[PDB]
Amino acid sequence: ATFAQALQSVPETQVSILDNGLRVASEQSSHATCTVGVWIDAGSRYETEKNNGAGYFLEHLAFKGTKNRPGNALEKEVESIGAHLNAYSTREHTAYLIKALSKDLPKVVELLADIVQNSSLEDSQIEKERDVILREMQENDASMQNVVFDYLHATAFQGTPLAQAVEGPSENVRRLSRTDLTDYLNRHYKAPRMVLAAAGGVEHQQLLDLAQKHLSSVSRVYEEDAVPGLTPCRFTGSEIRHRDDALPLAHVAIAVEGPGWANPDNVTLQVANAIIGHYDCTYGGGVHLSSPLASVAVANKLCQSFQTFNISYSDTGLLGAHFVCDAMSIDDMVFFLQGQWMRLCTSATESEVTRGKNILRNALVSHLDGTTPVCEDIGRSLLTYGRRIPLAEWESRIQEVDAQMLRDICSKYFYDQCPAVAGYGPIEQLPDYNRIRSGMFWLRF
């Protein structure tokens, strides 16, 4: 009745391949519900600056009508069976999720196959969703955190398809037509780039039979052998500063180049992110927080909040910290965050590393509690690693993590590296890039 025994008692996933290469994966639980989703390896990484909003348009237009059930018949069927439907898209992935009861699995998989195969793109719906997309980009402009992460991505991956956002620029939204959307569907919605993931009260034999029934006609071949190709994205050290002094608070995100999805240093770097920690002003820990950055933030009343991120893409990524503070604490927060990063780089402590390992174990297992995060992790794992990494394997890697290799990996990725800095708001006290570099190396080590 220990942690490793419970993680072994976690039931393993089942992965099968259709005749066209479409991956079909499932995790069976005792829940009376299920989450069935379709993951497509497509996004802004694959978009080529001319149809940069095509995936986001298809995210909007995927449920507004199809060939078999046009108009609102799809919504009527979904709300009749009681399913909750979701869709999202990041720069590398596009996911369509349906959470329903376990008995409605054939209807759910038929709806998903109809959505991802026979989507109808009516021109009036294209115009309506174009206006809706323009207004929602206006809302995201009026948002604050998404702006600075988009700025960070742009200034970190300038000149590469990773800089362009998921929504795409406004003139491109006004410029796309139905031909570009159909070209995106015929180019990026191929059979071996989809994983049909199911989690909950589903049988893998039933799921595979339904996938063979519905999703066996995808036309994995290309039009004129127009096979796309992944290319490495050049990270650069840079800064973008959108100064607008009328805003109440300042958002600053500082990151370095990540290791990628398949790099085994991600576990150690996530442990280090657990060492640095995240803090929000509505916390109950106070000054006695175990995270030293959070403790000094509470003690000096510096920032409203901070968080640490490790976003990973194919052999690349952004790894760093994002904080919101006032206009008179940006330099102090930068100094303290960089000092904590180099304390991790130079003098790592075994007790704090054990604390971070426990935090990370709790993080993965409490995230994987739930059928729709299980299905989400199945989709991401089969799209990135090519397999589902089990909880026992994650725990084994975490046990392999100790203070010495944490010190080595942190020195490899943080120490003396040119960062990407994105600032939005009253960022006059945000230090110069040369000062940020001078914080990125230490004179005592």
């Binding site: 449920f63 979904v78 709300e79 439907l85 109950g284 820990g285 106070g286 006695h288 927080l289 175990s290």
Partner: protein
């Protein structure tokens, strides 16, 4: 016993529920009937300061020791507070769950409540209320309860600005010693042994008194308030009295809420089966969001309509929503739509129970309210046992009942209660 939920009741009124699901992380929750509803006008905000005082120095563990030990384990200390009851939850690896129970029971049974700690904590109380009142729905429903009840449910879930700076350690001690007793508590646990939970219960919870203070029965008043704050959007909630927890009338009200529309099932969807969304979109071309609000408690309930509309079209949106509910009360509904509403309610309940945190919250709420565990099969059975004539009766009750209205925004065109 992974097959069934172990359940027992001590002679002192405490309830212990346990489950051996062999989960990698176990959850321990003490659910206490000590919400904001158990305060009169003299100690308002005491529950809020308690909710933020769940990490202070205690008789057995200091605040530093509690924080450092919890985050060294990696577990989560969380407090979930409603008007009716509060919930203290620790989550963590089953190897450290004994330390987690020790910290949890130390912070929920014997708190020292030093004056300097609460004096430093009241600023955090102000900040927490500001963050909670960032979004307009919190303020709307606080105002709605304030004008819907005379007492015992109109007490705000957050501390009033005048009570900020005046809540004292003796007030906190009085509230704890009167409402944190054994008969008003339930110790539930997922991933822990029932025997171990029994030992920690008999080691920490035998020194509390009994039934404690009763309450004030939550008398209804009705009425309205309007807060003009120049928002771009007008938020208006119009409710009336409904059934309490444990009634087939309350089940009918839940089915009616899911018939009228309790949220979107599709991202960026049109809400096709939502009657109020269809009725408002029939005669509007502006951004809107209309839904049915349902909130039942131990002794009273509130059912009504919530509209977020434009300033100019607020009257049309509210009148269309009220006309849709009046048509439902007259009987303009189909059995297929009732079946779809029941399917929506069953699915929503099942995905609520789906998450282990939600499962723990559900079993703890059942242990506090009924004192026994009702299986989800029985819950779905009674949801299916809800009839459509009961839905018509609930809609007629909301139509004929006295109204409580909370509105905010730019109220130049929002109608009054006598204008509906």
């Amino acid at each position: 016993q992974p097959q069934d939920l172990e359940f027992t009741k001590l002679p002192n009124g405490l309830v212990i529920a346990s489950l051996e699901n062999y989960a990698p992380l176990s959850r321990i929750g003490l659910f206490v009937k000590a919400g904001s509803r158990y305060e009169d006008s003299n100690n308002l905000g005491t529950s809020h300061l308690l909710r933020l005082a769940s990490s202070l120095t205690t008789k057995g563990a200091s605040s530093f020791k509690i924080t450092r030990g919890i985050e060294a384990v990696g577990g989560k200390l969380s407090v979930t507070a409603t008007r009716e009851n509060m919930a203290y939850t620790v989550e963590g690896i089953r190897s450290d769950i004994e330390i987690l129970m020790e910290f949890l029971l130390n912070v929920t049974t014997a708190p020292e409540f030093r004056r300097w700690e609460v004096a430093a904590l009241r600023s955090q109380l102000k900040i927490d209320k500001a963050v909670a009142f960032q979004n307009s729905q919190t303020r709307i429903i606080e105002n709605l309860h304030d004008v819907a009840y005379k007492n015992a449910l109109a007490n705000p879930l957050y501390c009033p600005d005048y009570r900020m700076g005046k809540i004292t350690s003796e007030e906190l001690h009085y509230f704890v010693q009167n409402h944190f007793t054994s008969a008003r508590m339930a110790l539930v646990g997922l991933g822990v042994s029932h025997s171990v939970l029994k030992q920690v219960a008999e080691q920490f919870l035998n020194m509390r008194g009994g039934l404690g203070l009763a309450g004030a029965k939550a008398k209804y008043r009705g009425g309205e308030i309007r807060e003009q704050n120049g928002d771009n959007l007008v938020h208006a909630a119009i409710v009336a009295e409904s059934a309490a927890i444990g009634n087939a009338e309350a089940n009918a009200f839940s089915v009616l809420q899911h018939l009228l529309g309790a949220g979107p099932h599709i991202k960026r969807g049109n809400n096709t089966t939502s009657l109020l969304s269809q009725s408002v979109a029939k005669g509007s071309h502006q951004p809107f969001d209309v839904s049915a609000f349902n909130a039942s408690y131990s002794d009273s309930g509130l059912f009504g309509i919530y509209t977020i509309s434009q300033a100019a079209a607020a009257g049309e949106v509210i009148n269309a929503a009220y006309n849709q509910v009046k048509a439902v009360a007259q009987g303009n509904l189909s059995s297929a739509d009732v079946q779809a509403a029941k399917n929506k309610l069953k699915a929503g309940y099942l995905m609520s129970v789906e998450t282990s945190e939600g499962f723990l919250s559900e079993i703890g709420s059942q242990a506090l309210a009924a004192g026994s565990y009702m299986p989800p099969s029985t819950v779905l059975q009674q949801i299916d046992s809800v009839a459509d004539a009961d839905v018509v009766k609930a809609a007629k009750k909301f139509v004929s009942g006295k109204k409580s209205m909370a509105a905010s925004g730019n109220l130049g065109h929002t109608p009054f209660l006598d204008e509906l």
